[PDB]
Design a binder for this molecule. Sequence first.
Ligand SMILES: *C(=O)/C=C/c1ccc(O)cc1
Length: 123
Amino acid sequence: MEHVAFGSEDIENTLAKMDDGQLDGLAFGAIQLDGDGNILQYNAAEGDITGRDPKQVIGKNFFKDVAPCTDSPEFYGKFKEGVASGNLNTMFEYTFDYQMTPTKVKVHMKKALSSYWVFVKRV
Ligand SMILES: *C(=O)/C=C/c1ccc(O)cc1
């Protein structure tokens, strides 16, 4: 395990430039998106929560392709507001239900220091 808690105040500093291997050591799901929502990084914990293969989703668009259930004002709308402002720091619960058993999660989206993080744990 990497020793980082979900929701930590300086999480973007701790995960800064973490490589794909170390990201796979986190206790929580971690996705890194570009400002368009394309997937740059996606860790093992997230693949375990959602069923997706962390190796295959890299390069797909999260909102258009992988996660249409997040293409909504409550998810994508918050993301894009944060991208446009260059300020993003929002934590909310959400249900993932596309081609999967509906799974409720706590989501933390936060601008990265490089890029935007989506951190995920079950609730
Ligand atoms: C809704 O379509 C959500 C899908 C989803 C969320 C998070 C993932 O990492 C993968 C798919």
